Design a protein around this nucleic acid. Structure first.
Ligand code: O7S
Lengths: 206, 7
RNA sequence: AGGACCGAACCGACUAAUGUUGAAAAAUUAGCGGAUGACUUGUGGCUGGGGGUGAAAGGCCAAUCAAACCGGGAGAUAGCU
RNA sequence: CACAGGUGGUCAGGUAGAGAAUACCAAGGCGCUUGAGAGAACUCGGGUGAAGGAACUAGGCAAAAUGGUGCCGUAACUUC
RNA sequence: AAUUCCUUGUCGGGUAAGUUCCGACCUGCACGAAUGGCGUAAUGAUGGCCAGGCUGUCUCCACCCGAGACUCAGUGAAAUU
RNA sequence: GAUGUCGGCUCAUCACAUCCUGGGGCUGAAGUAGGUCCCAAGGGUAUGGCUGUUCGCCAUUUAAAGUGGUACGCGAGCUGGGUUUAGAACGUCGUGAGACAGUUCGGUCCCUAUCUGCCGUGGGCGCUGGAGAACUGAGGGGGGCUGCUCCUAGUACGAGAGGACCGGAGUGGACGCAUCACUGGUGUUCGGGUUGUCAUGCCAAUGGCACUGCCCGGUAGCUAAAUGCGGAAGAGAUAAGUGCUGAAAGCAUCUAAGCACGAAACUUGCCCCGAGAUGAGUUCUCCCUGACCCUUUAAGGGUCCUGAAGGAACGUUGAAGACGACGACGUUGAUAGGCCGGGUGUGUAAGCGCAGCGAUGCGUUGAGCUAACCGGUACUAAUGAACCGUGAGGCUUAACCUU
């Protein structure tokens, strides 16, 4: 079904009763609110529009003010969309909590990766470094050949921006769901740095 | 002259 | 005592990297070899071009050497471009 | 060339040191005729490194360390 | 063998495995006695080989300090066409 | 009037005459394990010793260690051992100078990228009122490997020995993405020890220089050797192949009409880019409801008033970044810095006092110091402003308004 939007608060260690340490990626999934409910008669696909968080009064734009005021829902920090699986129904102004993930046992998180900036072939494509001595001339961490005896094929692995892109990790085990704190304990690591917004949706890969 | 250019 | 030892100056230049329209038309950095001797160095002088000199490499003889540079024969000759 | 060049001689302080080495200073003389900011790949010059330790490579290039003083002790071979 | 074509000769030693290396055999393609022969302590920035130690040489690269690369103002370059 | 040659390194890419994995036919296929042939190129496809070597032999692995094309791929990408200069020797030929595809030692590999191309990143214009967001997904990339073990089952088979497909589960190797909580590295911006030396007037106490002077530790951040995830399942149409029905051709036949199975290929489903998709898309919301002149009287020009929504610029800045860009905040404010507290790290400061001949030790004291981290705080600085873009959005047609 649908997912939710939260914040990467960080990572901590969870000790069970048998003395095992389960890595977790805590997420502050604030109470979400629906903004739009779209159908096929107008748009052409069953989905919803959800926001979260808050924003300053004298900083948000007027166009969005009416977009949020239309549904009588306080402004958020962004907007996202979730497709419905032919069996989901919602209404504007409806608030969604973290309990939605109570009986799922697995999710696929999504978020933006960290920013490495301009990266090299080694940092980026795990290229094999050349000889550091024994003759090498200014060609230690260089790629080498990029073709044959007359064009560089498209998709050629080269240096460039590394990170700051959409990334989706799949099949992450859930550990705990504390609605009192609006938290979600996801096992393992997830993209993005502390404070970045990320999506959490049930796992399709089982 | 010496081999490859210009050894 | 020593064409002796370790090792600075000094004289050399084995290796590597840099540099290679260089800082430099052969160097820099890191180490390296001889370092009282067939040592090294300053000033001055002499051997002069098919000749000089040469612990000899066809090496050097003013950034040019299997026969210097300059001038002249000379507008050499070029069945080749 | 306002040159990372070459070089003949003379003067030769203090602490440590065997020393004209080396390290910090004195005398005295300089900061090397463009700079500011940022802190990406890659290159150059360096520092550190988990575990393994020449498996690298045509070949162990450099680095580090052994590195100094005193004492004990010291093989084959030898023209002694 | 600084010499051996056939050839990585054959055997042995060393290595888990050694066209190289050492030690022997001799079938010396084509060693050989002052264009010297066989040895030879010491010496060698000499060639080849095996060890100990040492390490980012490597497995496999990671991070950091600096000089450039990048941006701004100034000067303003050079090569091919 | 120059197309630089073996091999190695690096980076790869296509073909299929398939090395492995997958799917099948016959088998002198009992089983296990092989042989032969067909379909199949999705992905994957050893390390080392000797040698300059490719190759090859050897050792030990692996599910397998594929065959070839790409200037025997790749030197404006590296190397320079080999080939391929001048030096010098051996053997051999020649009287000799010298020479050999005979060997042996030694021996300068330059180029700041204009165009194409490729990896990335922006400006401008356009998409027909403009602006702010959220999407559709035409299309285009990424990914696709696999061993072992247990149960099924010591079952079927077989005289035994030996030993299953089908199906299920778990755990690994290699590769790949993300991440820094743990284990660790780094940490020349934290602390301490300490040699030599100069200085701060001197003692004490500090600082500078010597690779951060040499060392021992270590925060954040980055990062792997560290720890989490991943390959699929499933569906449709198919290859070889197996078929049902069934005539032509009274029988037979997988086929001609019809119909059902069928693989890691292909199309899907998983992930990312994605409306410059000029075929330029779709939804919601917000802002502008002037006065005239003149004129080749028109999608015309100009003046006065008007200047919104929003944007940009500027500034404080970022787990964003080469520059642009992207993101956060700008006094109605915690954006940065500082300050307060706390934590971490270092490891009992300084000073005085006590003991001791003194070096030193003890107590004050787990003291003092403390970078980038956590939580808070307007103390300072992010300034009122102006700069920016307007004024109802063409013609035509059809249906509506005035079904
Ligand atoms: C002592 C020096 C060895 C000597 C070299 C002669 C010489 O003059 N070399 C200069 C290189 C010229 C080049 C690279 C010209 C390109 O524009 C065309 C070439 F690419 C074509 C090509 N060359 C080859 C084969 O095909 C070829 O054989 N060579 C090219 C590299 C040297 C090698 C050669 O000629 O070596 C000789 C050997 C044999 C005595």
């Amino acid at each position: 079904m649908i997912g939710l939007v939260g914040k990467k608060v960080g990572m901590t260690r969870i000790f069970t009763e048998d003395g095992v340490s389960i890595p977790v990626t805590v997420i502050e999934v604030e109470a979400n609110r629906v903004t739009q409910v779209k159908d096929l008669a107008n748009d052409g696909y069953r989905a919803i529009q959800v926001t979260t968080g808050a924003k300053k009064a004298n900083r948000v734009t007027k166009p969005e003010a009416g977009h949020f005021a239309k549904a009588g829902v306080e402004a958020g920090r962004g907007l996202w969309e979730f497709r419905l699986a032919e069996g989901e129904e919602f209404t504007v102004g409806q608030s969604i909590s973290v309990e939605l993930f109570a009986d799922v046992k697995k999710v696929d998180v999504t978020g933006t990766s960290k920013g490495k900036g301009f990266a090299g072939t080694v940092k980026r494509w795990n290229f094999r470094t050349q000889d550091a001595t024994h003759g090498n001339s200014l060609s230690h961490r260089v790629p080498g050949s990029i073709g044959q005896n007359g064009k560089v094929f498209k998709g050629k692995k080269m240096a460039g921006q590394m990170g700051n892109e959409r990334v989706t990790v799949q099949s992450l085990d859930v550990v705990r769901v504390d609605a009192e704190r609006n938290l979600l304990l996801v096992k393992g690591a997830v993209p993005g740095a502390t404070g970045s917004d990320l999506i959490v949706k049930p796992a399709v890969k089982a | 002259x010496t081999x490859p250019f210009x050894x």
